[PDB]
Amino acid sequence: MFLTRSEYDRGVSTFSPEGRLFQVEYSLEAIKLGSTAIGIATKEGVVLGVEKRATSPLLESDSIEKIVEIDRHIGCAMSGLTADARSMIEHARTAAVTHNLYYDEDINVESLTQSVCDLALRFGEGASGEERLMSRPFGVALLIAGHDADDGYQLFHAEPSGTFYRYNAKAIGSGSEGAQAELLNEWHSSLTLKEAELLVLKILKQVMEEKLDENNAQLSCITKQDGFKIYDNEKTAELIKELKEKEAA
Amino acid sequence: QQPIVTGTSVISMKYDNGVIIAADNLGSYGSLLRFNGVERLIPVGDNTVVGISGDISDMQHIERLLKDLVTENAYDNPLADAEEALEPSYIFEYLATVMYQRRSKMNPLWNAIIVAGVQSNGDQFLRYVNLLGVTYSSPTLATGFGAHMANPLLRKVVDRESDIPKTTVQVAEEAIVNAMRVLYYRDARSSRNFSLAIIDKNTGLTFK
Amino acid sequence: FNPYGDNGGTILGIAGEDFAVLAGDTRNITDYSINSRYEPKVFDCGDNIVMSANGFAADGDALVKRFKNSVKWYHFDHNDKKLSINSAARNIQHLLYGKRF
Amino acid sequence: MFRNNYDGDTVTFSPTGRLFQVEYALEAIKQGSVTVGLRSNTHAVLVALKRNADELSSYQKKIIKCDEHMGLSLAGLAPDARVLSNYLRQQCNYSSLVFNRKLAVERAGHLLCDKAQKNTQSYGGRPYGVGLLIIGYDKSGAHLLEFQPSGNVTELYGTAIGARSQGAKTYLERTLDTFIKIDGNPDELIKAGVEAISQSLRDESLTVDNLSIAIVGKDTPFTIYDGEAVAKYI
Amino acid sequence: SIGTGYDLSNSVFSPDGRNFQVEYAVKAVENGTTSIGIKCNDGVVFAVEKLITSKLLVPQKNVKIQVVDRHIGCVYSGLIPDGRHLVNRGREEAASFKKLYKTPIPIPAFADRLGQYVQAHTLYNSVRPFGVSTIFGGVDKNGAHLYMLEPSGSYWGYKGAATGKGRQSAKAELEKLVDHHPEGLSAREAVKQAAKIIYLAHEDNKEKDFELEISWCSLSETNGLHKFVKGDLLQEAIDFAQKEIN
Amino acid sequence: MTDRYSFSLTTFSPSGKLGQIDYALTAVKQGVTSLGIKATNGVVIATEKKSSSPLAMSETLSKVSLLTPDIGAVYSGMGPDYRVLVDKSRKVAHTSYKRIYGEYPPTKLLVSEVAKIMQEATQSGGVRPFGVSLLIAGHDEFNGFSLYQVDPSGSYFPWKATAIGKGSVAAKTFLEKRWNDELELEDAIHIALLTLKESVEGEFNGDTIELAIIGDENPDLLGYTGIPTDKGPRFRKLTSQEINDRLEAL
Amino acid sequence: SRRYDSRTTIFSPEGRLYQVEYALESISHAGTAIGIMASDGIVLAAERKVTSTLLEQDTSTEKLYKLNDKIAVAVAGLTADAEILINTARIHAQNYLKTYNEDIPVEILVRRLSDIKQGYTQHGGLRPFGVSFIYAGYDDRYGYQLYTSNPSGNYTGWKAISVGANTSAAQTLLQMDYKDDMKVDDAIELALKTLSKTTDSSALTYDRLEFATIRKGANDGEVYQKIFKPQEIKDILVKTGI
Amino acid sequence: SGAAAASAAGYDRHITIFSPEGRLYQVEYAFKATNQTNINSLAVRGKDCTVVISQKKVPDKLLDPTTVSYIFCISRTIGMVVNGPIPDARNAALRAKAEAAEFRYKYGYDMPCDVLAKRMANLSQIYTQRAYMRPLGVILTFVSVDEELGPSIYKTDPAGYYVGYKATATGPKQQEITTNLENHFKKSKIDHINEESWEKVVEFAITHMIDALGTEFSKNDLEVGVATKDKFFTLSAENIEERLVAI
Amino acid sequence: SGYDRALSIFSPDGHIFQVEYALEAVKRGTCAVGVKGKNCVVLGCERRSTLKLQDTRITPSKVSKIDSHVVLSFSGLNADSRILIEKARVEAQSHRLTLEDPVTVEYLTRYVAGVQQRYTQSGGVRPFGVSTLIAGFDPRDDEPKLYQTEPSGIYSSWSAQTIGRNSKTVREFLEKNYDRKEPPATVEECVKLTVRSLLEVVQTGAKNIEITVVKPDSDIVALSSEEINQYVTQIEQEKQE
């Protein structure tokens, strides 16, 4: 039988005889579009990093916010369908704040990641017998870089399908497959913070169409002491020229 | 609410091999004494009883569902004659949390519920709850004037936790039956009648 | 009609410097009537916490039973996290403030 | 080798009575991992196996607790196991509030044979493409089960789910005389499951990270063993 | 497959006044085990082939009878859960016949609160019918009763019933008895006389071993309630049966 | 060949036309003949009874039916979509108008309260319309006598002398060959049965026909003699014998 | 192509909703309706398709209508869906007066009543109205007015329009002889000429038509919804020498 | 050509779709269900006593024939007999039996068969407007002995048509029967039938559904009803043994 | 194909289509433009006047004002335009009620957007064939601001934009003539940058233009047709060449 994918494709709630339903597997293909992202974790500091897809020379590129704050000790990224993000994160923070009421403490990081993943699952029944709120499972594949006392510095990969993972060095989006092999072979368990910011500003170079500058990229780094901050342009340009001064020698 | 057909007191006590509880058989309308054929004791299984006071309109409402509770236990558990049956703690919490969720709704049941029986291991059980849902336990209990008159008495037989296995059945039945005498001697609404229930962790149960 | 009355009790509990305790009576009374002689009032609520409800009895137990049940949902969700006291400072602010009227 | 209709909703029948989207659900297990369970007169256990994405990536939850006299081990579509656990976490908690009793395990599967049938009748919804086991020691002895999306449950002395399994069940068809008499000695029962699962592999070698165990007993609560606390059995 | 258009849905009518989705459910009962119920001079006895797929299954505790409130029983042959969905409506309404009328529900008035429910599924469109055909009877004030339920919504009063794949067989051995014994069997030979049948009805499936189950309700031996069996009663009935056919 | 803009209603076709209404108006033209024409001092409403079998009492069901004393009706087409209509038409006099104005309504405001009972069922799928038609006919005291048609679309063309059903144009061809401006009722009544002798087959007697009138008050039908102003009904169904003489006068 | 015609929320790749445009040919079946804006009083007009002899075409105005003593309408489209949104308009104007105690302006309800016809070209399995209008009003802010509302929800203010059938010429004939002063009685003698010269028949009777007039023309200023009866169009009709 | 463009171009699976012939077909396909039993009832009037008869087949021996019946005592003074499958007869029977009641709770007397055929038929229309429910594949008869009208028969079909016959039959075999009493009435010109006793009128109606039916009948293959003032009920088996002795 | 009907369902690529098909409907509609300097923000829109009977005092003006300190333009189809404004200005006015500080513009555009990202969630509802441009300052601040909405439910900040018909000509015209790090610094210059941005595509008409500007102190103004003819014609001198 050859008409297994041709007909069982479009309705969400149709098992195909191979066991699988497709309209979720296509949602996974969405975030393969968009602009890439990286997350590296450390005993000393978590770090992210993105491109920006310079589209026109007159836009004000502080606006498209592939990276956000979500709480004082958590921060996100996303390499997917845009508008379906701002329906996500205005829930995800809302738990962390709500949690600061019902329990008066900086929430853990995974529980937040479990509240999201119990939201995209609303093309169906959620955990507590809920019914439905949508029919368009959406591509906003996240990276939740955070800190909490039990287990230190973490990141995750939260996908629409619900299931997630505690990756240590991830890279999602269009430049993944060329990267996630490159980060496969250059992740010790004993790196620094700044032995990573330069790294993630080397893979990003080779993988992206244009050349690398401050304008077409940025990054962030939380810390248990300072918090989520999105670095500055002239600060980033410090690291870029620093790299070249390391390459030639 | 405010009741009309209100019952009267009951009595309990624990002992070495089991417990004893009993009531009288009476239905009031005020000072009048209309009905005297009723009971106050609704057995459940072969280990457990429940005494009732208060509004007899509601005592009919308790017995209607306890018989159904055990019934809906038997559904799909062939094992549930021997060990997966209704011991009392499987019950009393149903007659407790019903009530707190029936008080806060503000249409309560003006009964005063006593429960007696034995677990499967063999140990004593006894507990109590009024309409407001409060709960407690001790080796001997009563209701209404029975607790203002006869509870002090029976505690002379059973002071506290120590002297429980310093006791037997023949001495036990021969105390409350003398407390029965008091209420028929002085209590306003009592009646000469009686209705007894004993339990034994070995011989089981019997009745009036 | 009156939905709640009185049952008695009188409690107290102290912190040291590297310890603490909690004390509570062990009698229940209706209206100068010994309703019972020994019925406890104070419970290890898991994660080495002790609490007590002195006053009306039923409410003083149903409140607890929601706290013994909140504490475990805190473990099932958040992966066996030990629940500090600061949490229960304002968690219990909510269980009660859900009944202000 | 041609199109068929009647295979587009759980509402409709075949021209013979085969509901299809259930016959396609429980094929889904065959591309989820393995996990097995065992019984005795005094102890239950189950063994699992993990799968990852890349060696950086963390491994995937395969046992989850529900209450201290129960558990489960899934094999299939996880989002439709996150649910069912959070359905019987409630029921097992419902009872303790209202009856102060321990729940009978065989009136938990009966509560899952229902919920997996409501979705099966009516338009909307899916058949929960999962297959999961149950364990526990209530008063009626040890227990084990084996759930399917159709609704049908069974109890038995220990089984396996998932792809590359039948090498196990052929083992457990042998030793049924043995691993049920095994009483008061957990640490050799558990060494059967780990032995069983190794029959049904394709050059994996059974690392510590790949594996996860649960156990109960006479007085032993539902406690799981993953990671460096598991290398005993290798 | 007379109509390729009039089968994709329910709530339709063919040109021949038919709806075929019911006529396909019935072919899901046929792919199910055998189950029977005999009527007797005092009560009834039920039975079933309980197949076993492996050696690993625990005996006598993957039961298949479902006991309604103490005086009527129900046995299935087909898709089990749609069944167990159905008693779990019959086990609740009968209460709602009790708390208004205080009598245990009779048997007929228990049927029309099923046989009228099932018929509801076979007239809407957003649902599926039931793939069962459950037998049920018991005892009441006015004697015994026994019925068949069938996914078309029909039910009729039977002295003997049999479904599953052993239909054409057990519809013979239940014709013989009702010629020998018009006077009403007693409730201590029908039982062993049931075991004779399921061991005869197995022979469509001589491949695989199995297990036998019985449940029985009559006034004399039980005082008017529903109950399983145990002990010498069924063991002899086993010993009775496989004897006679060897 | 089909059209793929006709299996449903909310779909426009390139000629800016809708699907099922055009066929409902054919469901009536296949139906029996019924009519009603007009006069100076009254209105007549007629049709026949094509009794299916001989054993069906053709009296236990009335094509014609009263809505108010001054207003009566008749259909042509489907039946069950008539007695389900009127039972929710006459009410609306007693619900929307009467109780907040004291008195029964005019003849056209009744129609507006029918035709939206007719148009509620042509705006959402999951509803076949009413495959019928109507000829409402009545009277009131500022605009006078009247006649009105009501199609399933919700439109209500008025008229003077008209018929509907299969035998329509043969009749409408005949009316103006016989219709006038100053005609009187008992002159306008034998017309409206010799109109019906052509569109018929077989028997033509009181037990295969029934019709109505409108006129001056019929207080003998009223019942409560003693009031000066409550002049009673204005609508009366002519019995068999009251018809069955006129034919022999013809 | 894969045919995008079946719901009014489908958006063909070129960006165009087909099932709205269809309505805008469901209007050509209608009966013409004209209104010219004078300097001292608007005129409206109309024409009917079905004019058989034995039906009372004397009192029954089917197209021309009122909304209050200031505003009038002339419809062109389906008739089942005119009562629905001309009672609503009446019910809107009063429920403005009732709670601001001054009269309704035109630009409000035309703005409103057209958004209603947009609330159906967007959501649900609903249909868009097959309707158009020719409003005719007065108000302090601008005085005399003319307006128009498609079956989409889009409206525009004008000086002289025909809707319905054969507007192509009836605009063309109109726009090349409409002076800009056009005293009211000189407007009527234009509107008939358009209908006289655009129609299909040759009779252009008194029964087929109705044309009304708004008039401020009285002393002690106020408005007058003058509708004309059959007896005086005849005076209009003989006077021209048809 | 008749249903060729029907069976191909839809029009046979939605209820609420007309054909360009005007015909909707689903309800016109319901009637094929009425004959799915090969069963054939009857009804006739009296001076004050009404009767209805039905076969009661001889299937496999295992049935309990006390319960197989298509005669349902609805209320007092009322009764009904169906033509169609059993399950689609109950839901009509029960929607009625809880409808005569509330009337008597809300209007102070018992409904006639007039209204009871106008009410239940005012519903089967509705279910051919909406998609609530497939129209019940039946055609059902009512009976009564009213105070103001005397005996009365009525009839109802899945569209909503209802007329009160004088006498009628139904099933696969109407033409044979119906002629064997249509010709009978033109003899005497009596809408009713003579033989005052509800007894003697049965034996009239039996024998006409023997000669024109096609075979001979025992006591078991039949089940019969009757309506008399204050009552409605069913019957015994001797009424035929006291026929053939006379002949 | 099959995947190009609805909103609920995806391609086997990831693309969701209907949203992409709305933006084709934008481009069947008249232009618009928005420029900002430092003391000024502006807006333009090429109208039509192609009919003579139509009265011109109520000319179809793309512009709408949400509050005193905010303006708007649009594109696409106008049956929907009246809606978003009629919910937008409601929301600005139900903000200062609830807060007594008017809208940060970034609060507004997240409600014009928000009403588009609800009408792209569920079948049974249609998107908006529309695409806006916002222009207005905050209260008590000078920073000139400008966003655009889009039926996908997204929005971005822009120093200069042109949408509607033939925008793919006007953008690159503005990629030269602008420079982010030296904006125009006078309310004349943005207009001249803005007018000659229309003159590529507008058949050298001058009756076919509308300009409306905005400044602090709750300032807005529409300009005069005779104030354009001298902002028009003086350019033509400057291409005497």
Q: List the determination method.
A: cryo-EM
Q: Give F-chain residues touching H20 at CB under 8 angstroms.
A: 6, 23, 26
**The pairing of beta strand B33-35 with beta strand B27-28:** antiparallel
Q: Are residues C74 and A111, on separate chains, in Cβ contact within 8 Å?
A: no
Q: Give D-chain residues touching E57 at CB under 8 angstroms.
A: 154-157
User: What is d(CA F210, CA F45) in angstroms, rounded to the nearest whole number?
Assistant: 9
Q: Does G172 touch chain I (CB under 8 A)?
A: no
Q: Which residue of A lies nearest to D26 if distances are taken between CA atoms?
A: A19
User: What is d(CA A148, CA A112) in angstroms, rounded to the nearest whole number?
Assistant: 12
Q: Are residues H90 and E175, on separate chains, in Cβ contact within 8 Å?
A: no
Q: Give B-chain residues touching D97 at CB under 8 angstroms.
A: 93, 97
Query: Which tokens go with A140?
Result: 């906003």
Q: Give H-chain residues touching E13 at CB under 8 angstroms.
A: 26, 29-30, 32-33, 134, 137
CA atoms within 13 A on the CB side of H143: 31
**How many Cβ atoms from other residues are within 10 Å of residue A176's Cβ?**
19
Amino acid at A41: A
Active site residue E103: no
Name the residue range of residue H130's domain.
Answer: 10-247
Distance between E88 CA and the closest CA of chain D, angstroms: 10
Q: Of E205, E225, E204, which Cα lies nearest the Cα of E216?
A: E225
Name the residue range of residue F191's domain.
Answer: 1-249
Q: Does D176 touch chain E (CB under 8 A)?
A: yes
User: What is d(CA I73, CA I96) in angstroms, rounded to the nearest whole number?
Assistant: 23
User: What is d(CA F93, CA F113) in angstroms, rounded to the nearest whole number?
Assistant: 8
Q: Give C-chain residues touching D93 at CB under 8 angstroms.
A: 69, 72
| Maximal C-alpha separation, chain E | 57
Catalytic residue among E4, E33, E53, E103: E33
Strands ordered across the beta sheet of E226-228: E160-162, E35-39, E44-51, E210-217, E226-228
How many domains does one find in chain H?
Answer: 1
* A245 CB burial (10 A radius; 0-12, 13-18, 19+): exposed
Nearest to H122 among F2, F58, F84 (CB): F84
Contact between residue E204 and residue E166 where contact means Cβ atoms under 8 Å apart: yes
Conformation bin of residue G8: beta by default, left when phi > 0, alpha when psi is -120 to 50: alpha
**The pairing of beta strand I133-135 with beta strand A74-77:** unpaired
CATH superfamily of G1-242: Aminohydrolase, N-terminal nucleophile (Ntn) domain (3.60.20.10)
Helices (H), D51-209: 79-98, 112-121, 166-172, 186-197
Nearest to F159 among G54, G83, G130 (CB): G54
Chains that touch G (3 or more CB pairs under 8 A): F, I
Q: For residue A3, is it within any domain?
A: no
Contact between residue I71 and residue I40 where contact means Cβ atoms under 8 Å apart: no
Rounded to 5 degrees, φ, ψ at H181 are -140, -15
Chains F, H: CB contacts under 8 A, how many? 80
- Sign of the C-alpha dihedral, residues G9, G12, G15, G19? negative
Contact between residue F149 and residue F133 where contact means Cβ atoms under 8 Å apart: yes
Q: Are residues I53 and G9, on separate chains, in Cβ contact within 8 Å?
A: no
List Cα–Cα distances, F36 to F161, F209, G60, in angstroms.
Answer: 6, 14, 19
Q: Of F95, F148, F85, F144, which Cα lies nearest the Cα of F120?
A: F85
Cβ under 8 Å to F: G residues 93-152: 125-127, 130
Contact between residue H20 and residue H37 where contact means Cβ atoms under 8 Å apart: no
Q: Does G200 touch chain F (CB under 8 A)?
A: no
List Cα–Cα distances, E41 to E72, E138, E139, E224, I41, in angstroms.
Answer: 16, 12, 11, 13, 99
Nearest to A102 among C81, C84, C91 (CB): C91
Contact between residue B5 and residue B55 where contact means Cβ atoms under 8 Å apart: yes
Name the residue range of residue E9's domain.
Answer: 4-246
User: What is d(CA G73, CA C50) in angstroms, rounded to the nearest whole number?
Assistant: 80
Query: Which tokens go with B38?
Result: 């009723």
Domains of chain G, by residue range, sit at: 1-242
Q: Does D65 touch chain C (CB under 8 A)?
A: yes
Helix (H) or strand (E) holding E242: helix E232-244
For the D4-234 domain, the top CATH level (class) is alpha beta
Which of the residues H12, H17, H120 would you substitute to probe the F interface, choosing the one with the greatest number of F C-beta atoms within 10 Å?
H17
Distance between D192 CA and the closest CA of chain A, angstroms: 30
Tell me how far the alpha carbon of residue I37 is from its chain's centroid.
16
Contact between residue F233 and residue F218 where contact means Cβ atoms under 8 Å apart: yes
Which of the residues E6, E117, E123 would you substitute to probe the H interface, choosing the one with the greatest number of H C-beta atoms within 10 Å?
E123
Residue showing tokens 């005892």: E139
Contact between residue H84 and residue H32 where contact means Cβ atoms under 8 Å apart: no
User: What is d(CA G149, CA G139) in angstroms, rounded to the nearest whole number?
Assistant: 19
Q: Give D-chain residues touching E84 at CB under 8 angstroms.
A: 110, 113-114, 117, 151
Q: Which residue of H lies nearest to F125 if distances are taken between CA atoms?
A: H16
Q: Are residues A105 and C86, on separate chains, in Cβ contact within 8 Å?
A: yes
DSSP class of F95? I
Q: Does A154 touch chain C (CB under 8 A)?
A: no
User: What is d(CA D38, CA D213) in angstroms, rounded to the nearest whole number?
Assistant: 12
Please report, for the domain that includes residue F77, its CATH number. 3.60.20.10
Residue showing tokens 């087409």: F77
Q: Which residues contact H241 (CB under 8 A, 6 or more apart)?
A: none
Contact between residue I72 and residue I85 where contact means Cβ atoms under 8 Å apart: yes
DSSP class of D99? T
Q: Which residues of F touch H (CB under 8 A)?
A: 2, 6-7, 20, 23-24, 26-27, 29-30, 53-58, 60-61, 79-81, 83-84, 87, 121, 125-128, 131
Chains H and I touch (3+ CB pairs under 8 A): no
Contact between residue B21 and residue B197 where contact means Cβ atoms under 8 Å apart: yes
CA-angle at G226, arms to G223 and G230, nearest 5°: 180
How many residues are listed for chain G in this entry? 242
Q: Give D-chain residues touching A169 at CB under 8 angstroms.
A: 56
Q: Are residues F122 and G80, on separate chains, in Cβ contact within 8 Å?
A: yes
* E24 CB burial (10 A radius; 0-12, 13-18, 19+): buried
Q: Of F10, I132, I81, which Cα lies nearest the Cα of G20?
A: F10
Amino acid at A204: L
Please report, for the domain that includes residue H200, its CATH number. 3.60.20.10
Domains of chain B: 1-208 (3.60.20.10)
Nearest to I125 among G114, G123, G158 (CB): G123
Distance between D53 CA and the closest CA of chain E, angstroms: 35
Q: Does C79 touch chain A (CB under 8 A)?
A: yes
User: What is d(CA H168, CA H147) in angstroms, rounded to the nearest whole number?
Assistant: 22
Nearest to E57 among D123, D156, D169 (CB): D156
Contact between residue I44 and residue I194 where contact means Cβ atoms under 8 Å apart: yes
Q: Which residue of C lies nearest to B102 if distances are taken between CA atoms?
A: C3
Q: Of G99, G40, G38, G109, which Cα lies nearest the Cα of G73?
A: G109
Chains that touch E (3 or more CB pairs under 8 A): B, D, H
* Torsion from C-alpha of A72, A78, A82, A88, nearest 10 degrees: -50
User: What is d(CA G118, CA G154) in angstroms, rounded to the nearest whole number?
Assistant: 8
How many domains does one find in chain E?
Answer: 1
Contact between residue B12 and residue B126 where contact means Cβ atoms under 8 Å apart: yes
CATH number of the I2-241 domain: 3.60.20.10
Please report, for the domain that includes residue A192, its CATH number. 3.60.20.10
Which of the residues A3, A63, A79, A88 would you substitute to probe the I interface, choosing the one with the greatest number of I C-beta atoms within 10 Å?
A63
DSSP class of A201? G
List Cα–Cα distances, I8 to A22, A136, B187, H87, I35, in angstroms.
Answer: 13, 5, 77, 41, 37
Which of the residues B136, B137, B156 would you substitute to probe the C interface, choosing the one with the greatest number of C C-beta atoms within 10 Å?
B136
3-state DSSP assignment of residue D203: coil
